[PDB]
Nucleic acid binder design. Structure first.
Lengths: 214, 51, 119
RNA sequence: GUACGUGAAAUUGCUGAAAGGGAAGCAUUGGAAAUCAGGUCAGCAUCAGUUUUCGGGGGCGGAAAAAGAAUAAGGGAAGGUGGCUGUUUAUAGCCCUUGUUGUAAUACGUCCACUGGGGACUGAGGACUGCGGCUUGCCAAGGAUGCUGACAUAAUGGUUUUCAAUGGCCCGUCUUGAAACACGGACCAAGGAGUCUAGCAUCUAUGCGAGUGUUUGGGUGAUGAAAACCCAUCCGCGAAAUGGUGAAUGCAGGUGGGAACGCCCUGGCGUGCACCAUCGACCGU
RNA sequence: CUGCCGAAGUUUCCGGAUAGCAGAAACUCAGAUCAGUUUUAUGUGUAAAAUGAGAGUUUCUAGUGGGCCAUUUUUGGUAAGCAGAACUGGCGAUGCGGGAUGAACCGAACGUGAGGUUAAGGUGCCGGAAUGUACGCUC
RNA sequence: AGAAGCUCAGACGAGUAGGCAGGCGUGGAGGUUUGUGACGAAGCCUUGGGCGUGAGCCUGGGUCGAACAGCCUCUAGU
């Protein structure tokens, strides 16, 4: 009776401390990058920000008239439907995947708000091969307690910062089922994003697209 | 259990359930209240206003 | 809870309107080029399991009870414990004498009669 | 009423209702008229879920916006002003650099677990459990309740006919990659096409099990006796194979994997069916 | 009558056996293997990280063995057409939005509905949607 | 607690050849319903009502005048 209430109360405070620690980390990382860029500019030096280990990929072309070589990759990316968004560990083994499914998907660097809103609204966990909504921290705790992930904030951190267990967290998240964008795509959507279309890599504009889709 | 899905962003009560930290967040902080140091190298300005 | 039906029109057999020899009772078209089996535009709709109605309200009349066929006063007694679930429907071949006896017994038992004012 | 039980459809005449400017039938949504059936239908508030549309406030970022204004230096000139075509701020001013007012503003990007409104769709579930919040209690916290009205001679829901908007190419067969063709189709009613049996094989069920199978036949059966019931002797398949002979050497043989169980302090040990690789035999076992 | 599963569309050997695709039955396998995929390494082939998915076999039993269209490479070309391969696609088993109309064009793949938002294509009127905005060309 | 049942959760839904399952209807047979019926069985008709996704089922009214059905099994000139 009292033991479970005390343990859960202490667990609640522990999550609060972790979330406070994570929030400070994001603020410090953003502030320190700004300070580094400011000092480089003052000295005349050029500062290169680090590569983004995280990418968010949205499938923009349907299941019709797609070559088998490209189809298998979206099967491996769990992009089995149009307007489906997933997190991918951006590395040298993924850059080549996304370069050959350039005409069929779009991707970019998601900021903290994009990841935070996606898991809050579209966050569904794969529990016993079922799509269970992440409606409470105990759902995540029983499914990711081995990797010391206890709450939604812990899951957001493990996804945003690409921690050691990013593969387990990304595989736990059922692919986000995003709606059609509010306001629509561009006039011609299947042209490359650079050439005025809406396909391929788009860097920090994946956020502006995702907010439409949420 | 969980007959209906409630969006934490639109539900202040569900947000409290999921994230026991939103009760103390302090979103806006005033940090540009000291002498704003205009930080721009003169060589950088020449390169910027080049050609 | 109210009763809502996914469909109200009946499903007619194709071209039953055109031909008197072709009855309106539904028959699944086996034609290979049947545009109606292909679900073209403007064509009529086919029976699908998606048209099935709510399990909790299936077989229920507008009033919210299920019609139960009754032949004699013995049958009505079987509806004593389900007067809020089943409504007695006297059979069409029950004579006028047994009609009034069935109606009176059901009315005393509190069991609804669907076609009481008949014969 | 012998043109005689019941009297269907095709088809035809009459009457009523309606429609019709070179097809029609059909489908969807409603109106109108007709006709049925059984609480019906509205308004607002506070919420929940989905969503759309306007604002307000505040962080942070960039050349710590660029500008700009005001105000001090110097520089230059014009698309040359006052002055006198030519010149250098005068009786207009402009451009460039610097200082200053400066932690200037604003635009913009971005963020707020900041906030104020307007509209629409939805109300699934049915004692209590849960996760939380505010404080036993209360709550926007595991799905709608509250306050009212109007109407019952009508509102809603239908059903029939018709009109309007939108859509809708004739069905079957055949050929081909595919159509189209090519046949079939005046209309309606009734009839009308994978059946019975012998053998074989698979699977399943049932009875018995090293057996199994009564119904060639006999017994018997008073109530239907072509049924049911009982079974003497054979016989069929199986129990032995190999090409006359004719099988545990070895717990009807050891090793490994293995179903299942047991003992332990996940794993270990023991036992180890079926089946499968293995060394082995006996005349296939 | 409704529901579920669901191909082949052709190799390889002599009308067929075969394999392939689809199912069933019975087994073992989760400290395991797979993959119409990408990296890394060794010299296009070979070998070992990423990502996804539980992955295997044995028996046996249905249906299939055509073509059409298009891309790319290439072989010749030829008055000019085209002809010969390979290649994976699209159709074939499949409705829907648009292209005024359509087997092959652009989107999209289907239980019955409510609401929201889009794709392709569009916003003078037929026709739902700006006789919008800005800059040019044209009689 | 018709465990054949009850309940919770998630995903999926075109579909020819083929494969598999559950249902509707008809004639006759065994059992059963203290079954229906000249106070009207069956049939038929109807701009009457209800149920089912569907095959179909029940019912109001009219007509009619002697037989008929539900359930469990059997059977087929279904």
């Amino acid at each position: 009776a009292a033991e479970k209430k005390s343990a859960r109360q202490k667990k609640r405070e522990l999550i609060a401390k972790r979330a406070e620690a994570y929030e400070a980390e994001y603020r410090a990382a953003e502030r320190e990058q700004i300070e580094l860029a400011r000092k480089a500019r003052a000295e005349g030096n050029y500062f290169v920000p680090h590569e983004p280990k995280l990418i968010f990929v949205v499938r923009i072309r349907g299941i019709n008239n797609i070559p088998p070589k490209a189809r298998k990759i979206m099967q491996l990316l769990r992009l089995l439907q149009i307007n489906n968004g997933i997190f991918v560990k951006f590395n040298k083994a993924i850059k080549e995947m996304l370069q050959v499914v350039e005409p069929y998907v779009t991707y970019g660097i998601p900021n903290h708000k994009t990841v935070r809103e996606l898991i809050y609204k579209r966050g569904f966990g794969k529990v016993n091969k079922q799509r269970i909504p992440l409606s409470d921290n105990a759902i995540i705790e029983a499914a990711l307690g081995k990797y010391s992930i206890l709450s939604v904030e812990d899951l957001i951190h493990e996804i945003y910062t690409v921690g050691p267990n990013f593969k387990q967290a990304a595989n736990f998240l059922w692919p986000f089922k995003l709606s059609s964008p509010l306001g629509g795509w561009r006039e011609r959507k299947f042209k490359h994003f650079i050439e005025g279309g809406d396909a391929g890599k788009r860097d920090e504009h994946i956020n502006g697209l995702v907010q439409k889709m949420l | 259990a969980h007959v209906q899905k409630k969006n934490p962003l639109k539900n202040k009560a569900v947000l409290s359930r999921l994230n026991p930290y939103a009760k103390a967040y302090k979103a806006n902080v005033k940090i540009n209240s000291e002498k704003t140091p205009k930080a721009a190298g003169e060589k950088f300005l020449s390169v910027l206003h080049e050609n | 809870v109210n009763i809502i039906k996914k469909r109200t029109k009946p499903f007619k057999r194709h071209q039953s309107d055109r031909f008197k020899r072709v009855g309106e009772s539904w028959r699944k078209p086996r034609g290979i080029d049947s545009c109606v089996r292909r679900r073209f535009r403007g064509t009529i709709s086919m029976p699908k399991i998606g048209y099935g109605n709510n399990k909790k309200t299936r077989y229920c009349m507008p009033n919210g009870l299920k019609a139960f066929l009754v032949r004699n006063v013995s049958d009505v007694e079987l509806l004593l414990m389900h007067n809020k679930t089943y409504a007695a429907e006297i059979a069409g071949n029950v004579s006028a004498r047994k009609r009034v006896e069935i109606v009176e017994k059901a009315r005393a038992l509190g069991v609804k009669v669907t076609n009481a004012g008949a014969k």
